Every structure is written in structure tokens, then in C-alpha cells.
Design a protein around this ligand. Sequence first.
Ligand code: HEA
Ligand code: HEA
Ligand SMILES: CCCCCCCCCCCCCCCC(=O)O[C@H](COC(=O)CCCCCCC[C@@H](C)CCCCCCCCC)COP(=O)(O)O[C@H]1[C@H](O)[C@H](O)[C@@H](O)[C@@H](O)[C@@H]1O
Ligand SMILES: CCCCCCCCCCCCCCCC(=O)OC[C@H](C)OC(=O)CCCCCCCC[C@@H](C)CCCCCCCC
Ligand SMILES: CCCCCCCCCCCCCC(=O)O[C@H](COC(=O)CCCCCCCCCCC)COP(=O)(O)O
Ligand SMILES: CCCCCCCCCCCCC
Ligand SMILES: CCCCCCCCCCCCC
Ligand SMILES: CCCCCCCCCCCCC
Ligand SMILES: CCCCCCCCCCCCC
Ligand SMILES: CCCCCCCCCCCCC
Ligand SMILES: [Ca+2]
Ligand SMILES: [Cu+2]
Ligand SMILES: [Cu+2]
Ligand SMILES: [Cu+2]
Ligand SMILES: [Mg+2]
Lengths: 551, 55, 139, 184, 66, 299, 143
Amino acid sequence: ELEARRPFPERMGPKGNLIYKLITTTDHKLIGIMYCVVCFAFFLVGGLMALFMRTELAMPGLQFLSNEQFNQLFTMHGTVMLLFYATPIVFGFANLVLPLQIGAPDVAFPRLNALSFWLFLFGALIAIAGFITPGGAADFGWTAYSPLTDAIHSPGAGGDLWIMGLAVGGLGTILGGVNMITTVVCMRAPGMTMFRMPIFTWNILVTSILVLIAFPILTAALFGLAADRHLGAHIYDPANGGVLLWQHLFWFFGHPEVYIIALPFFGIVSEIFPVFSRKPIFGYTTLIYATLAIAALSVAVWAHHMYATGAVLLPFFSFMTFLIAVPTGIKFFNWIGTMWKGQLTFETPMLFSVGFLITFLLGGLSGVLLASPPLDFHVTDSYFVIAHFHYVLFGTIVFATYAGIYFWFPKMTGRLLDERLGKLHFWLTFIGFHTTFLVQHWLGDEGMPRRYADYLPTDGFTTLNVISTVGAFILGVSMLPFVWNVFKSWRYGEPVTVDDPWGYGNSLEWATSCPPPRHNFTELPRIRSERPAFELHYPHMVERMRAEAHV
Amino acid sequence: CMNDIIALKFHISLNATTWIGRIGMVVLPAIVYFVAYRWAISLQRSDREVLEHGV
Amino acid sequence: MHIEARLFEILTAFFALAAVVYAVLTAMFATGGVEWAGTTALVLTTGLTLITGTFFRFVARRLDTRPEDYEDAEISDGAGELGFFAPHSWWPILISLSFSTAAVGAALWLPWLIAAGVAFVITSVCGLVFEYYWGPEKH
Amino acid sequence: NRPNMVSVGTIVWLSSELMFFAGLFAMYFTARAQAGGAWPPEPTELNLALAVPVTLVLIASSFTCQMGVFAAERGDVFGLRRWYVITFLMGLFFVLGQGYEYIHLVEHGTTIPGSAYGSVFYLATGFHGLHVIGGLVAFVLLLARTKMSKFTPAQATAAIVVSYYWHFVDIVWIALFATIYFVR
Amino acid sequence: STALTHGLIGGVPLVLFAVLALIFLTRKGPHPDTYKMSDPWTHAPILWAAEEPREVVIGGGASGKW
Amino acid sequence: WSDALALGWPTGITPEAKLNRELWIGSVIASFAVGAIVWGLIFWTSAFHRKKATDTELPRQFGYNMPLELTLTVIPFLIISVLFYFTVVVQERMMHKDPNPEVVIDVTAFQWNWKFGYQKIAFADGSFDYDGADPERKEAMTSRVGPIRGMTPEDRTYLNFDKIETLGTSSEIPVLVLPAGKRIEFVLNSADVIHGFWVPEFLFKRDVLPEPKANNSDNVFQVSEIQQTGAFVGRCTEMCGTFHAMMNFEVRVVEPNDFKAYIDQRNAGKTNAEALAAINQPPLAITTEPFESRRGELV
Amino acid sequence: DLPYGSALTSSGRISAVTEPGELSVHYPFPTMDLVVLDDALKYGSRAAKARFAVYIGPLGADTAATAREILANVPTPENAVLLAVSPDQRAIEVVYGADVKGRGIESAAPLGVSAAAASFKEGNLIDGLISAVRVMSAGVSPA
Ligand code: HEA
Ligand code: HEA
Ligand SMILES: CCCCCCCCCCCCCCCC(=O)O[C@H](COC(=O)CCCCCCC[C@@H](C)CCCCCCCCC)COP(=O)(O)O[C@H]1[C@H](O)[C@H](O)[C@@H](O)[C@@H](O)[C@@H]1O
Ligand SMILES: CCCCCCCCCCCCCCCC(=O)OC[C@H](C)OC(=O)CCCCCCCC[C@@H](C)CCCCCCCC
Ligand SMILES: CCCCCCCCCCCCCC(=O)O[C@H](COC(=O)CCCCCCCCCCC)COP(=O)(O)O
Ligand SMILES: CCCCCCCCCCCCC
Ligand SMILES: CCCCCCCCCCCCC
Ligand SMILES: CCCCCCCCCCCCC
Ligand SMILES: CCCCCCCCCCCCC
Ligand SMILES: CCCCCCCCCCCCC
Ligand SMILES: [Ca+2]
Ligand SMILES: [Cu+2]
Ligand SMILES: [Cu+2]
Ligand SMILES: [Cu+2]
Ligand SMILES: [Mg+2]
């Protein structure tokens, strides 16, 4: 029984194996791969923006940055790192495994799926292109409040390019969300019922609905904003009532948008915990209800970002915001229950997911504090917020993103990332993030507002800013091990000759080869539960799972 | 040659346009040569796929 | 596809309840009367789920149990041609470039560039639509 | 049977489009609440002698569009072309009718920078007019595809989903027409 | 001061990188140890063949022994 | 210890601030208790449920505990309900406005500094009455048809002006003088964009909006009293432009007799700097100093 | 008969799994050395238009006859060259197909054995195979 095999898998394709594929591909796997590379390019670009800001806020006074440059820095940093990195990578992972999870050969609209990538890429470049302008890029913040974003207060072309760049990228997001809903409804494999899909597929379908509610209203608001700057309209005139009008629409977009970049990464860890715990996902039916409740509740809580304005019904939004804490808390108890009485080995995909649980909770606790208007009356527009949202956005779009990458890299490569290099990256990232964002809780409470280019030496913010500056550079140097691991393990990584390199995979992508073929499936097993791959690979456990399912 | 009008219409510094063309006078031809060489060879592979697998 | 429509109806009920409650809760308690920008979005948020939910209801009542909608369905039940899926196309990148050209013209307020972008978008969209329908050349 | 993938995608996207008009409606309603008693204020004077006949033409375009759908499902490509050409002509009349009303309103002092009412009125109706123009482009593109190949069920599906967009556009105008010309 | 502030920002990340790297990068990876001639061949038989050119009578051969 | 559980919150100088800080400490205690339980559960399973290197069979495959799921759903609902009640109680006290205040302050924010005016002073004991309303300069902004309800966007009639005003300068931090132990009313009106009136010792802030009445914004908030004297810094908190970070102000609290005297020099034509020196107070702000005009050290 | 976690699919393919943190290949040679050997095998066969094969393992009692049966597993046996090395038996056997005959392989077959043997006394197995492939591929004409 001798089979002929190469000593090593081919490192790279021959000349001309990719360039024509990149611009003509309709395969979701290649499109999903192009997302991650571009998303990480914007991650590195946006991360450098924060480093300039962080190194300027190290010592009191403007050493190398002006007020205008600093104002442009956080606006572009936030815009790039929420809309150009976080939102696309939601569909970056969705183009990767969602057709595999539901047993589909492709997405519903292969052409429209490819259009979303290029539309997003050219939309993101337009907004960033404001830096090359002499006036500079947008300097009014990613919330672009009115009438600051007005032609009178923002006359440069950088703000105009920021508005139109978001509109082009927003159109791609809407098309991507349309594709995902159609793919889930119509492209499901036989035997794959609605309540049999993986949690990640459930989260993406739910997230895509939130896209259709939020992004079109943002496109409408931006178009009205462009009319004011170019046609001299009175859409957002303060005397007309547009100061509240713009904020209401923008936050009706914004809070659904943060859950657009939260629920899919809740799904990502929900696929990793069962695999490395050798246990089924706890509360699988409950997790779906929690996700639906989170999606529904996220639409009518938009005004808790507007507590300091004194123009919203505080009791309504405070109570509704508190309601979101219940389904989110249920997710932790299900994730903890998944690891309970299991067999944890703590690999790199598992290690990052564990860091998510520790990191996310502290940011979640800060969210409940801000949800109450009396407590928000003092910490709003201060570094307590910045500490809260860099604990909740770094717990998911980074920890869960890295966990999913380490989880699905062998699936889409046939090669395994280095575990020793992965452990170094995780610990460096954890230590750096905690060092740079734990002290900012005290800074905001001490009386330091957000969006401040300079502070006086007598303010007493110097010591904590230096500590935060040290940790941020640790985050910067933590990128080198991960980039090196991806660069080396892609071509010289450990080959994967098995369908499931992690052994106890549950979703359908682990029932196919690594990498999957062009149509993702040369065979399909019988689907009788939410873990078809586990049932196929371990037939002797079919009886045990049914009998021991209920405690 | 049209940098000054491009600078005025597209809101770009005139010094930037001169130096973009100056650096791009050697960098861009090198980039285009690499892309075109791979693109031309990539097209040949696309034709080989139809020959051995059909339309 | 009973479950698919039930998901949107569940969202429809909550969105309708929130829109009605919040409108009636701002008309008598918010300063200035009804919150309009804010209420209008909630009312039409229900319409987004109402349109999709109603269509899914009508579709479900027409077609019988699908192989993917069957609790205990066999893999061989779904054998056959699924449909048409585009193998490759360079049109989508041209559409994005065409749309980005108009956006840059709109951002800088260049009427000539906006007109070129609109013409480019129509030309690029025409290629995408007609890509798999152009007949052989008649010479 | 089988769920129509193209119809599902179009309907799902059409629902998202409704949220785009939600922003436009919010601007009009927010400005209306701040009018103080004059809505529309002087010198704006809306007339129903022109809006009503133009609105009725757009409503009648839905009936002709639906007639083409029946021909499309029946396999009669020529019947589909006849009804969609008529729908295109009456849909074009809506744009010309709206454009004619714009000229008179501008000449009477109602412009986008002139008044806050002019801003909410023009962007709300103008963006809908852009949707009508986009729908007219869809009619031409679909009609051009009918002469390229034989009438296939996939070709008939494209005719149905185009009518879905036209029906959505007509429904949106009815909301805009009632909100602007009646709820003053 | 200004010297201490710049030293911590540029020194601690480099110091932490070196300490953390020595902990993990010095560990033994999952790759098996290199086979030695003295040790017996306990591994399964290995058949290696190239994929080129792209797709039984024996013409002869040669023998050897070391 | 209240100094460590406040996480850096100032002690406060008003009764509303003291009540707000009490809610903050209790909420932090509740949050830490919940966080410790979840962290303990995560750490317990990460150290005692690790794959033992002698356990052959896979672990029990259980993923549904209906009695447990309901219990861990009601408990979070009870905690937020308890917090919501205290949240409603505190916010009602903080936003309460007395119909008969004794000091009214007109706060005007612009790009990029502050202007403070004394609209009306009427002490509760009747020892000091003053009327700072100046209607001969508020109606000079009338501008009229108009794009918005008959008026141009440059109407500016919503702005309030007073006879005695403290104008901020790029080289002089504006100082607001308030009596100790007296109720203060703050009226916030912006000029071009949104700003932020935040005093960290107040433990409360509200965004300064242009045309607050047309935006349905309650731009008026009051404090019951100021419990101690001294100087307290104030910063702009809502992003407003280039110099958002360089438009700070200072609030000076003095005795009621000193406050009454200070108004007399201001009425006598004395500027803010010299009037403060007349009541044995520093002429300039001590908590904050004007920022350097040099765009940086490389200029 | 299938290993733990391995299953037989409907189409006959084998869906195998490996424990997390483990390898699916685990060849007892460095990764870089394997890459060099693949380059020698891939490029050497390309310049010779004859598939080159490398076998490591037992060869039974008679090494010459065992390699003949092993070459049958190599794709396109008629145009394949197999190099068999038995570390335990300390013997080298080279066998080629009928199409390889008359192409200049008879002068390179002892060349590869001697070159591989010389590096085999130094404790280098992968290096010996790499050296054997290079000299054997350099003495074979295309087609
Ligand atoms: C996904 C969301 C996301 C992510 C991942 C991050 C990442 C980081 N952010 Fe950011 N941030 C936001 C979202 C995010 N941010 C948002 C929404 C805002 C508000 C915007 C606004 O105020 O309007 C904000 C604003 C914001 C603030 C407060 C703004 C203010 O001062 O008012 C700060 C504090 O310094 C901060 C710092 C950091 C740091 C140190 C990181 C670290 O993660 C970054 C370190 C990462 C690196 C990658 C370092 C770079 C490494 C390199 C090697 C660079 C080399 C690159 C090239 C050569 C191309 N960001
Ligand atoms: C992933 C992104 C993300 C997520 C998940 C969240 C989650 C939450 N956020 Fe936040 N938020 C942002 C991203 C996010 N946020 C951003 C980017 C901003 C500001 C951006 C800007 O302004 O520029 C922001 C700002 C923001 C504000 C506005 C504050 C201000 O501007 O002044 C508020 C107000 O309530 C808020 C609250 C919450 C709450 C209550 C949750 C809850 O969902 C969290 C609930 C989670 C838990 C509660 C943990 C699990 C529960 C348990 C373990 C049980 C414990 C039970 C109790 C404590 C009762 N966040
Ligand atoms: C035709 C395209 C070919 C491009 C190919 C690639 C080649 C590009 C090389 C990059 C060159 C950039 C270096 C310019 C270096 C330089 O001289 O410029 C500086 C200003 O920075 C900058 O330029 C930074 C911007 C960099 C531009 C990046 C290039 C991307 C563009 C080219 C892509 C085009 C989009 C695609 C087109 C689509 C068509 C189809 C493809 C300062 O000058 P100034 O402006 O005087 O500012 C004064 C201070 O200096 C002084 O201190 C003081 O502060 C003041 O005096 C200040 O005024
Ligand atoms: C290869 C060129 C890549 C871009 C070169 C410049 C890319 C340069 C990136 C590294 C250096 C950045 C380090 C930080 C520099 C800084 O602190 O500012 C000082 C400077 C004085 O202020 C600036 O504003 C700098 C320019 C900002 C970057 C414009 C990004 C343009 C976006 C797209 C338009 C790019 C299109 C690429 C098109 C690529 C070519 C396609 C043919
Ligand atoms: C511009 C049309 C005016 C007529 C109004 C009535 C509508 C019917 C149009 C029928 C067109 C038939 C063309 C055809 O089948 O040829 C097809 C090819 O022509 C095209 O592709 C024309 C595309 C036009 C794109 C521009 C659209 C602009 C829309 C503006 C809306 C305001 C078939 O060619 P073939 O038979 O394969 O040789
Ligand atoms: C990995 C966790 C890092 C946490 C850093 C906290 C540092 C706090 C220092 C406080 C110093 C006050 C003077
Ligand atoms: C959710 C509350 C988080 C609180 C973090 C506090 C970090 C400690 C800062 C110490 C600073 C001492 C001056
Ligand atoms: C006192 C005014 C009551 C208004 C009831 C709510 C009206 C909502 C209008 C939404 C229209 C969306 C098209
Ligand atoms: C006080 C008047 C409130 C008017 C609300 C406007 C609702 C208009 C809805 C029209 C929908 C027609 C389909
Ligand atoms: C007088 C200074 C007291 C500092 C107390 C710091 C407390 C830090 C708590 C951190 C909690 C993290 C969950
Ligand atoms: Ca500094
Ligand atoms: Cu929020
Ligand atoms: Cu300000
Ligand atoms: Cu400010
Ligand atoms: Mg704010």
C-alpha cells in the first residue's frame, strides 16, 4: 500500500497563477482570502495612525504633530479601523466558510460577491486619499457630528472624499449582506435545516439583516450631508433642527453597526470552543434566541450615545440598553458551559478565544456603567469611553479574528501556522493591549476628554499617558510575529493531509479536504444534527451524544 | 504636463504632483512591467485551462 | 421554508411594538413632541422585515417541503442541477472603478467627472448584464 | 418545488432600499416639525393640477408592468416587450412631468438653497426621480437582453424581478405624494 | 523627565519581546527529529514522486550497497 | 475605600455630584462582583478541566440544561432592574430644576473659547439683587423669505447677552466666579458648532448646542449648591474643531460676600483680571494656563 | 481497519482527522531539506521529461526485485525513474522504466549510486538523495 506523494507541497504556483484570478474570480474562497489580506493592510495602516497619536500623547505639548494633524489622525484611524477593517472582515470570514458550513458549492450571486470586494476596496481608498490633499483628510471624527462636518466648518476636500468613500464602501456592504441572506435561504444542502446550521452561519445571516437596516440610512444621511456642502442645502441647519437630525440617523446606523462587527465574531468563538473542548456547544438553541434578541434590541437603543445632548428620552433608552446585557450574558454562560467538564488543550485558536472571554467582559461591564445616564453624565466624551470601546472592539474584531484565522488557516491553505510563534503573538498582544488600555479608565475618570491633541503638565495626565504609550508600542511590535508566521507558514508551513487538522470539528467544512476543491465538496455526509463532521468522523459517538444531550 | 490643472481640480499640492511624477517616472514603469509580464503569462494559463478541461 | 419566514416575523413584531411604544412615549414625554427622525426610522425598520417576511410567507405556502427543509432528508434527495453560477468575470471590477470615478467627481464637485462616471457605470453594468447573453458574431 | 433565488435576492435588497428612503423621510419630518405654522412656507405653492395626473400615470405604469409579467410567465417574449415599452414611455413621462414641475417651482423662488422646505422637498422627490431613472435604465437593459437569446425561464425571471423594483418605486411615490401634497 | 519617558517607550517593548520570545521560540516544535543513520528506520516506508511531467516493462537498472 | 472604588472620580462639590458618586461606587462594586464570578469560572475550568494525559474516552456530551438556562436568565434581569431603579432615581435628582434660582449664568461657547455672562442674581435672603438682561443687543441679530421659518441661518437670536460678561482669550483662560453654597443655573448656547460644558468636580456635563430650542434640547441645568470654595478646571468635551483641546476654562468659587463684592467692580467697569485681584484672589486661572501659540516645538 | 477519527465517505474518499497540535505528515527530516529535495525532484524531472521517484524503506531479502514492484506505484511507470534506499539494509537500488532506456540513464545510474553513497557515509540521508537526483537528472535528455 504505497502511494506516491511529493516530499513537500508546492510552495507557490507558477508565474501568472494569481494575477488574472484576482480580478476575475467568482470563487468565495479566493474572494474571502483577498478580504483578509486587504483587511490586514488597512489594520496595519490604521494601527500606524494610532501610534502617531499615542506617541504624541506621551509627553505634554505638541512635539511633532499639530492640532489639525492629530484631529485628522483619529478621524481616519476610526474610519479605517471600524469601516475599512472590521466591517469587511465580517464578510471576509463569511465568504470563507459559510458556503462550506451549509454544504453549498458557491454563494448565491458569485458576480455580485466579487463586486462587493472591489467596490469596498476602491471606496476605502477614496477616503484614505484625503491625506495627499494639502488641506488633509477628515479631521471631524468618525461620528462626523453636525454642523462641524458643514462646508463652513469643514471646507476642505478631505471631508468630501471621506463622505463619498463611505458611500461606495457602504454599497458593497449592502450587496454583501444581500448575498448572505440569499445564500443561507436557498443554497442549503439537503438535510441541513434552519436549526441545524452552525452558530457562525446563524450569526452572519442575522448580521446581514442588521446591515440592510443600518447601512442604507447611513447612505441617505451622507447624501444629504453632501447636498449641504455642495448644493448649499439646509438639511442639517441648526436652526432647522438638523443638529439632532444628523445625530439620530448616524446613531441609528452606528449601534447596529457595532453589532454587525460583534455577532459574527461571537459565532467564530462559538465554533472554536466545542472543537477544543471535545464537547457539544452548550445551549445551541438558546444561543440562536440570544443572537436574535441582540439583533432586535440593537435597533432601538441608538440614543444612549446621546445622553449628554439632553434631547432624548432617557428612561426609554436606558431601560432598553440594559435589556441587551441579558442575552449577551447568556452567551458567556453558554461558552463557559461549553468548556465546563471538558478536555481543554489550549491551542492557538483556543488560546485566543479564551483571551476574548477575559477581555470582552471588562468592556461589557463598562458598557452597563455607561448605559445609566447618571454615570454617563460624567464619563461621556472622555477616555473612559475610549477604554470601554477598545475592550469590546478588541475582544472581538481582533481576538476572535485571530482565533478564526488560526482556526481556518489550515482549511484554506493546507498548511498549519506555527504554534510556538502563535503563542508568542497572543501573549504579546494580550500584555500590550492590557497595559495600554487599563490605565485609560483612570484617565477619563480623572477629567481627560477624548479627541485631545495636547494637555498641560499641571493636568496630571502625564504618568498614565506614558504607561499607555508603552503598552501601545507592545501592540505594534506584536504584529511582527503574526506577519512573519503568516508569511512563512503559507509556503513553508506544516502540510495538512487530513480533512480536520483539529480532530473534533463540528461544522461541515471539516468534512472536506484542505484546501477544499473549487466546488467545496466531493461528497456529503448525512446531516442529522449541528455537528455532521463530528458524527461522520466518530460514528461510535452518535449514540452517546443523543443520550447525554440533556443533563 | 497637466500637473498644475490636476493640482487645482483634484486638490493636490503642486510640489507633490511634481515629485509624484518624478518618483513615478522610474517606479511606475517597473511596477507596470512586472504586472504586465505576470498578466500576459496568466492569460496563457487561462487558455490552457479551457484546452484541457473545456468551456 | 417555514422557519425562514418565522425569523422575520419575530423581528417584525418587536420592531412594530418598539416603533408604536416609542412614538407614543415621546409624544407625551419627550421635549418637543414626537421624535420624528428617530420614529420614522423605527416605523420603516418594520417595513424592511415586513416586506421580506410577507414574501417568504407567500413563497413558503406555494412550495412543498424542500430537501433542506426536511428533518430527516437523504443526500441523494437533492441530486440534480442546481442552477447557473458565473465561473469568472472581470466586469465587477470595472463597475467598481466606474462607480468610484463618479464618487470622486461628486466629492470634488466636478460636473464633467460625474457625467463620465455615470456613463461608465451604465456601460460597465451593461457588460455585466449582457455577459452571459451575447450571441455569436454574425460576421 | 424551488425558491426563486433571483427573486429572493431582489426582494431582500428592495427591503434595504426602503431604509434609504427612511433617512429622506426623517429629514422632511424633522424640518416639518420646526416650520412653526407655515408648511410649505411662502412663496412655495404646490399645485395638484399637475402632480395628480403625473402620479396617476406612474400608478398606471404598475398595471402595465404587471401585464408584462403575465406575458413573461406565459413565455410570450413579444407580449413582454410590448407592455414594458408602454411602461417605459409612461415611466419616462413621470420624469418629464416631475422635471416640468421643478422648473416652475424654481422660477417661483422654491430652490434647494432658497428655503429649508426646498431642501427636504427636492432631495426627497429628486432621489426618487433618480430611482425612476434607474428603473428606466433597467427596462432598456432587460429589453435589450430579450433580443440576444431565446426566451428562457431565467430570462423570464429577470423580467419579474425588474417589475418588483418598479412596483417598489411606485409604492414609494404614493407615500411621498400623500405626505407632501396632502399632509401639509 | 524626557529621557526616562523615551527609554520606557522604546525599551520595554523590545525587552518584553526578547524575554517572551526566549520562552516560546526555544521550545521544541511538533516537527519530528531528524533521522540518523545509526538509529534503525522505525518510520513507515516513504514513496516520493514528482508531479512533472503532467499525465509495466522495466528497461533495467543498477544496484549498490554502502 | 471610596478613594479606590471611585476609579479616579473626583469627590464632587455639589449635592448632585455626591449622589452621583455614591451610585458610581455601588455600580462598580456590583460590576466587580459579577466580573470576579465570571473570571473565576473561566479560570476554574481552564486549570482543572484541562485534557488529563490518561483520559481515553471523550467527555460527557451534554449541551442542554433547561433549569440552569432559566436561572441564569432571570438573575441578570433582576440586577439590571435594581440598577435601573437607582438610575432613574439619581437622574431625576440631577436634572431637577428649581423654579426660583438665585444665580443664572449665560454660558456661550464658540470656536474656540468660552464666554460667561451673569443673566440674573437674586439671593434667597434678599441681600443681593441684580438683573443682567441686556435686550438692547440681543435683538440686533434679527435677519429676515428666510430659508428657515422666515429667518436666515445667521439669525443668532437664540444667543443671550449680558451687561457683565467674561470673554475668553487665547492668552487668558476665562474664569467664572460663583458664590459658595448658592444655587446656580447654567444656560448653554453655542454659536457655530457643538461644544461641551464639563467640570470634572461637578461630575456632570451637557453638550452646548446651537439653536437648542429648535433642536428640542434642554440646555438648562442647575446645581443645588457648591459646598466648598476654590478653583476648578473645565474642559470642552464635544469635538468642535482645530482647538478643541485648547479651549479650557476655570470655575472660581468664592464666599457670597466676596461674590457680591466682585460684581460691584465688574459693574464699575473693571475687567475680570483686576476684579478678582480686588477680592484678594489671583487675577489669572491657577488650575489651568493658556496654551502656547507655537503650533509646536518645531515652529 | 481505519485509524481513529477516520471515516469512509460515500464516494470512497477517506476523511481523516488529527489531534490538535499534531502533524499529519511528520516526515523525520527538516522542512528546508524536504524543500530542496522537492526542488531537485520537480526541476530534475522537468529538465529530463522523466518522472523521478525516491523511496526509503525496507527492500526485503533481494533489493533488486523489490524496487521493480515499488516502481509500479509511481505514476506513469514506463517513464519513471525510482531511487530506492534502505537505511537498515545499507543498499541502494535504481530502477527505471522502458521509455527511460536508451536516453542516457545507463551512464547516470552508477553515477547517482556512487554520489548518494559518498554522502551516505557522512550521516546525511536527504543530502545523499538530493545529490543522487541532481547527477541522475543531469545525465538524462528530454523525451
Ligand atoms: C476595530 C476597531 C479598532 C482597533 C482594532 C483599534 C486599535 C488601536 N487604537 Fe483605536 N479607535 C477606534 C477603533 C479601533 N482602534 C475608534 C472607533 C476610535 C474613535 C475614533 C474617533 O475618536 O473618532 C478609536 C480612537 C482611538 C483613541 C482615542 C482617540 C482620541 O484620542 O480621542 C486611541 C487612544 O490612543 C486609540 C488607540 C489605539 C491603539 C493603540 C490601537 C492598537 O490596536 C493599534 C496598534 C496596532 C498596530 C498594527 C500598530 C502598527 C504596527 C505597525 C508595524 C505599523 C506599520 C504599518 C505599516 C508599515 C503599513 N484609537
Ligand atoms: C463590539 C463593539 C461593541 C459592543 C459589543 C458594545 C457593547 C455595549 N455597549 Fe458600546 N460602544 C462601542 C462599541 C461596542 N459596544 C463603540 C465603538 C462606542 C463609542 C464609539 C464612538 O462614540 O466613537 C460605544 C459607546 C457606548 C455608549 C455611548 C457612551 C458614550 O458615548 O458616552 C454606551 C452607552 O450606553 C455603550 C453601552 C454598551 C452596552 C451596555 C453594551 C453591551 O452590549 C455589553 C453587554 C455585555 C455584558 C453585559 C457582558 C456579559 C454579561 C454578563 C457576564 C452578565 C453580567 C450582568 C450584569 C452586569 C447585570 N457603549
Ligand atoms: C500617475 C500616478 C503614478 C504614481 C505611481 C507611484 C509613484 C508615487 C511616488 C510617491 C511620491 C510622493 C512624494 C511627494 C513629496 C513632496 O514633495 O510632497 C510633500 C507632500 O506630501 C506628499 O506629497 C504625500 C502624498 C503622496 C502621494 C501618494 C501617491 C498615490 C497616487 C499617485 C495614486 C493616484 C490614484 C490613481 C489614478 C487613477 C487613474 C487610473 C490608474 C511636501 O511637499 P509640500 O506640499 O511643499 O508641503 C509643505 C511641507 O513640505 C513643509 O514642510 C511645510 O509643512 C509646508 O510648506 C507644506 O506646504
Ligand atoms: C506604491 C505607492 C503606494 C502609495 C505611496 C504613498 C504611501 C505612503 C505610506 C508610507 C508612509 C506613511 C508613513 C506616515 C507618513 C506621515 O506621517 O505623513 C507625512 C506626510 C508628509 O503626509 C502624508 O500624507 C503621507 C502620505 C500618506 C499616505 C497616502 C496614502 C494614499 C492612499 C492611496 C491614494 C494609495 C494609492 C496607492 C497606489 C499604488 C500605485 C498604483 C499604480
Ligand atoms: C434608448 C432606447 C429608446 C427607446 C425607448 C423604448 C425602449 C426600448 C429599447 C430597446 C433597445 C433594443 C436594443 C437591443 O436589443 O440591442 C441589443 C444590443 O444593444 C445594446 O446592448 C443596447 C444597450 C443600450 C444601453 C444604454 C441604455 C440607456 C438607457 C437610458 C434611459 C433613460 C441586442 O444586440 P444583438 O441583437 O445581440 O445584435
Ligand atoms: C498586563 C496588565 C498591565 C496593567 C498595567 C497597569 C499599570 C498601572 C500603574 C499605575 C501607576 C500609578 C502611579
Ligand atoms: C471596568 C473598570 C476598570 C477599572 C480599571 C482601573 C485600572 C487601574 C488604574 C490605576 C491608576 C492609579 C493612579
Ligand atoms: C402627534 C403626531 C403623531 C405622529 C404619529 C407617528 C407618525 C410616523 C410617520 C412615519 C411615516 C413613515 C413613512
Ligand atoms: C400630525 C400629522 C402627522 C402625519 C404623519 C405622516 C404619516 C403619513 C403616512 C402616509 C403613508 C401613505 C402610504
Ligand atoms: C489610590 C489608588 C487606588 C487604585 C485602585 C486600582 C484598582 C484597580 C482595579 C482593577 C479591576 C480590573 C477588573
Ligand atoms: Ca505631545
Ligand atoms: Cu452603543
Ligand atoms: Cu469646543
Ligand atoms: Cu471642543
Ligand atoms: Mg458625544
